[PDB]
Swiss-Prot record:
<dbReference type="GO" id="GO:1903553">
    <property type="term" value="P:positive regulation of extracellular exosome assembly"/>
</dbReference>
<keyword id="KW-0965">Cell junction</keyword>
<dbReference type="GO" id="GO:0046982">
    <property type="term" value="F:protein heterodimerization activity"/>
</dbReference>
<dbReference type="GO" id="GO:0005737">
    <property type="term" value="C:cytoplasm"/>
</dbReference>
<dbReference type="GO" id="GO:0030335">
    <property type="term" value="P:positive regulation of cell migration"/>
</dbReference>
<dbReference type="GO" id="GO:0002091">
    <property type="term" value="P:negative regulation of receptor internalization"/>
</dbReference>
<dbReference type="GO" id="GO:0070062">
    <property type="term" value="C:extracellular exosome"/>
</dbReference>
<dbReference type="GO" id="GO:1903561">
    <property type="term" value="C:extracellular vesicle"/>
</dbReference>
<dbReference type="GO" id="GO:0006930">
    <property type="term" value="P:substrate-dependent cell migration, cell extension"/>
</dbReference>
<feature type="domain" description="PDZ 2">
    <location>
        <begin position="91"/>
        <end position="166"/>
    </location>
</feature>
<keyword id="KW-0007">Acetylation</keyword>
<dbReference type="GO" id="GO:0045121">
    <property type="term" value="C:membrane raft"/>
</dbReference>
<dbReference type="GO" id="GO:0005615">
    <property type="term" value="C:extracellular space"/>
</dbReference>
<keyword id="KW-0597">Phosphoprotein</keyword>
<dbReference type="GO" id="GO:0042327">
    <property type="term" value="P:positive regulation of phosphorylation"/>
</dbReference>
<dbReference type="GO" id="GO:0046330">
    <property type="term" value="P:positive regulation of JNK cascade"/>
</dbReference>
<dbReference type="GO" id="GO:0005546">
    <property type="term" value="F:phosphatidylinositol-4,5-bisphosphate binding"/>
</dbReference>
Length: 191
């Protein structure tokens, strides 16, 4: 989680899509969904990201509807966007024990308890926080099943990106859980 406002430059794909849903939160606009193999993935937009400007205009106070209408009306040879990096999230690094554990339980992405004498415990991992990424890989929508499988195959240093549940539940409302599952970019980044 950088302390960074950065500029990204986008390009509507062949069908006029950039692959992005936006959500009004606290008079800001946030990334609710980055679609896999989209403009928005290639430039490296991330769930939770904040969109400060779109073509040099401020997003402050915009409805979701307007953000989306703004995107459609734009001449997608070049869309500029000014981004604040995942501002509602934090990253925690942890090391697995010899039993491979980091030392928590989660349910529906959400960390529900912490296990005494663990790295989870040593590192002040918190409950009531949804899991957003792991070692930099979006994991929103996947079954708990599949998130366990990522954790097991991670190596010792595991890196988790969390978000307060209340904020998380506020971001994803009005998005059908299957769209999340199939269409949210769960892929490692291209170079
Ligand atoms: O993209 C537009 N609106 C955002 C999508 C939408 C949301 C709600 C609604 O009721 C209808 C459309 C648009 C495009 C041309 C003229 C006006 N609006």
């Amino acid at each position: 989680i950088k302390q960074g406002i950065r500029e990204v430059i986008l390009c509507k794909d062949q069908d006029g899509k950039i692959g992005l849903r936006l959500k009004s939160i606290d008079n800001g606009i946030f990334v609710q969904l980055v679609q896999a193999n989209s403009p928005a993935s290639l430039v490296g937009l991330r769930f939770g990201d904040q969109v400060l400007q779109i073509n040099g205009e401020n997003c402050a106070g915009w409805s979701s509807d307007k953000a989306h209408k703004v995107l459609k009306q734009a001449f997608g040879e070049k869309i500029t966007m000014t981004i604040r990096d995942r501002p509602f999230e934090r990253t925690i690094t942890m090391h697995k024990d010899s039993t491979g554990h980091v030392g928590f339980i989660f349910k529906n992405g959400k960390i529900t308890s912490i296990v005494k004498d663990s790295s989870a415990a040593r590192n002040g991992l918190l409950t009531e926080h949804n899991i957003c990424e792991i070692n930099g890989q979006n994991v929103i929508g996947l079954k708990d099943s599949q998130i366990a499988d990522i954790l097991s195959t991670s190596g010792t240093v595991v890196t988790i990106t969390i978000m307060p549940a209340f904020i998380f539940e506020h971001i994803i409302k009005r998005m059908a859980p299957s769209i999340m599952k199939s269409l949210m970019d769960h892929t490692i980044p291209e170079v």
